[PDB]
Amino acid sequence: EDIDIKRKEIINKEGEIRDLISEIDAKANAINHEMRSIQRQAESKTKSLT
Amino acid sequence: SRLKEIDGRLKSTKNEMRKTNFRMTELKMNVGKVVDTGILNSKINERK
Amino acid sequence: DQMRQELEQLEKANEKLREVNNSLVVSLQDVKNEERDIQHERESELRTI
Amino acid sequence: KNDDINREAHQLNEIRKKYTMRKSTIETLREKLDQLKREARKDVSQKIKD
Structure with a gap:
């Protein structure tokens, strides 16, 4: 049962890692x-906006 | 129709994510019982 | 003990699956630009009418 | 990293369990040699009486 709870904890951690990397890809x-x-904006930043 | 197609693709990707989660769980349940207790070699030592 | 080989093969399969779906999810915000553009076009046409 | 350290701790406990199976091997070997001596006792006495 100790091995089982450790494995469920690391599976939850892997799911959190997947969520984090998906959020990182969205932020990228x-x-x-x-x-x-x-x-x-830097290309168009001139007088009279164009 | 384009946004319908993209949300259908999003649902398909969610289903693929669920399938990968199931694959991870079954790989865990497979490799969790490799060298746990099946090292009973007393009988084969007696045999040898 | 022998199935660990198929297990690492399925791990590589999960790796290829995660990379293909990561390349797929980054193809979902490109249509956000065009939908924002067409919604701005509709806003401008309602301002015009 | 905590997963890795508790996994190596579990592996050390497993090689600690290698002493338990080593202790049971000399325990079942005792039963094996006892059965051998019991079956030989009924054989040498049988040959003597024969």
Whole structure:
């Protein structure tokens, strides 16, 4: 039962790791979108906005 | 229809995630009982 | 003890599955840009009408 | 990492259980030699009386 509870704990930890890496991938997509938008903004940042 | 297709794909990916969770659980239940107690070699020592 | 080989094979299969679904979930925010664009177009058309 | 350390602790307990099975081997070997001496006692006495 000790082995069993340790294995259930590490399975919960693996699930939490999967959730964390999915959130990390979502944040990477968000940072890529923010980088391309700020690149467009730096390209368009001129007088009369164009 | 495009957003319907993408939410269907999201449901399919969720089903694949559940399948991978089931695979992890069965791999755990398989490797958990490898060298636990089946090392009874007294009979084969007597035999040898 | 012998099935540990098929077990590590299934672990590699789970690795390939997680990598393909990670490459799939990063293909779900590209349509967010186009849906935001079309919703902005609809907002502009309601402002026009 | 805690999973790894408790797993190696469980492995050390398993090789500690290797002394338990080693203790039972000399225990069942005692029964084996006792049965051998019992079956030989009924044989040498049988040959003597024969």
